[model samples]
Target: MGPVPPSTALRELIEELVNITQNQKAPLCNGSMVWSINLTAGMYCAALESLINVSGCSAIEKTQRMLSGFCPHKVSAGQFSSLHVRDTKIEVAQFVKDLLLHLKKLFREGRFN
Candidate 1:
C-alpha cells in the first residue's frame, strides 16, 4: 500500500492558494510548458511532478512547496497523459488551479477513493 490518501487536506490547500485566482494579461509563469498529468492515488505528486519545472512564477511557488510535503517520496516519475497545453500563454500556476478545480469535482463525485 501507499501513504495516506490526501483527499482531505488537498481541498483546503486549494482554497489557500489565492495565488492562482488573479487574472493576468501576460503569460503566468513566463510562458513555460510542462507535460500534462493524471489524477490518481498519488495525484499530488503527479501534479507536482509535472509542475515542478516551472520557474519565474512567484505565485505558484508556495503551492508547489506545499505539495512537496504531502507528495510521497521513494516513488519515481511515471507517464501517461500525452497531451500538451495548447495555449502558449497560460502559466503553470493557472494550470494547477484548473487541475485542482477538477479534482474538487472528482472528489465530490466519489471518484477519489
Candidate 2:
C-alpha cells in the first residue's frame, strides 16, 4: 500500500488545527507585512511531542533525521507570497498546519509498522 489514511481521531485533530490557523491574524507594521506564527508553531510542536510519546522518542527522532538529511530542500517563509500580504497570517498558519498533518501521517505509519 502507498500510504494509509488518517484515523478519525487524527482527522479531528487536524481539523482543529486548521480551524485555529484559519482564525490567525496579524497587525500592520511600517508597510512591511509581518505575521507572528508563534502560536501556530506552538500548537504543532505540542502535537508532534505527543507523537513522540506514542511512537517512541527514538522513532520520531529518526523521522526528523530522515526529513532533514534526505534532501536539502526546506520550506521557508520566502516561498510564501501570501505571507507578504498585510493580513495573511491565516495563510501562513495553514501552511504549517498542513505540514503538521503530514507529520501526523508519518507518525501514524510508524506506529503501525
Candidate 3:
C-alpha cells in the first residue's frame, strides 16, 4: 500500500520547481542544502520528514507542503538516506532541478509504483 495520489504530490512538486528553475536568473535558495534524495515510491512521507531539515531553502517549501499532504505519517525502511551531503555545495535550484528531473524520468519509466 502507498499514499493516495503520491504521484500527483510528487509531480506537482516537480512542476513547482520547473517554475522556480525557469523564473530564477541567479542563485537559488542561496545555494541551499536540500539533502539529496532517492525517490523510492514507498519512500514517500519518510522522505518528506527527512527533507524538512533544510534550514532556509524556501524554494522547496511548497514542495514540502505538497509532500506532507501526500501522507501525514511515516513509512518503513525510509528512515534516512545513506548518501550524505558532501562538503561541496550545490544550489537548491540545481539540486531540485536535477532531483526532480531524475524523479520525472523515473516516473515516466515506471520505476515508481
Candidate 4:
C-alpha cells in the first residue's frame, strides 16, 4: 500500500477556513492582507484538529480554552484595540505559520503519537 495523499477532507477544511471572514479594505499595520478577527478565530478553531492529531486530545482542551480567550469574538473592539490589535495581526500570522511547521514536524516524525 502507498501513503495516502493529502485528502479532500484536508483540502476542503482549508478552503472553508480560507474564507472564514471577509478581508478588510484597511489592511493590517504591516500592510499584510487583512483578515477579520472572526476569520482568525475560525482558523484557530479549525486548527485544533491538527493539534489534536499531534498532541493528545486530553492535553489540549485547556489550551483550547486559553486560546479561545484570544478569539476576537470573545472580546469587544475597545478591548482588542487597547491590546494593540494591529501588532497582533503580524504575530498571529507568524503564530499560525509556526503552528503549521509544528504540525508538519509532527507528521514527518510520527502522527497521533
Best by TM-score: 1
Candidate 3 off by > 4 Å? 1-4, 35-50, 70-89, 110-113
Task: Write candidate 1's Cα lDDT for 26-111 as tens digits.
Answer: 55665786765655666766677676556567776787767776665433334423234442434565566667676677668755
Q: Between candidates 3 and 4, which one is better according to lDDT?
A: 3
The 10-residue segment of model 2 with minimum total lDDT is 27-36
lDDT of 4 by residue, 1-113 (tens): 66333343234333432333124233222333222232332554434332332223332345455344333244322333223234333333343444444433434544311
Spell out the clash pairs found in candidate 2: none
lDDT of each: 0.61, 0.38, 0.60, 0.36
Cα-based lDDT at residue 82, candidate 2: 22
**Model 4 spans with C-alpha error above 4 angstroms:** 1-90
Better of 1 and 4 by TM-score: 1
Q: What is the lDDT of candidate 2?
A: 0.38
Per-residue accuracy of model 3 over 1-113 as CA lDDT, tens digit each: 77656567657667776887788898665554555555556354545655655657676667777666755654233454434545343456666656665667767765553
Ranking by lDDT: 1, 3, 2, 4
Clashes in each model (backbone N, CA, C under 3 Å)? 0, 0, 0, 0
TM-score of 1: 0.59
Q: lDDT by residue for model 2 over 22-109, one digit each (tens)?
A: 6647411122222423223233432232222222324234343333332233434234322333443333333354466664764556
Residue 91 in candidate 3, Cα distance off native in Å: 2.0
> Each model's TM-score?
0.59, 0.28, 0.58, 0.26
Off by over 4 Å in 2: 1-6, 27-95, 101-113
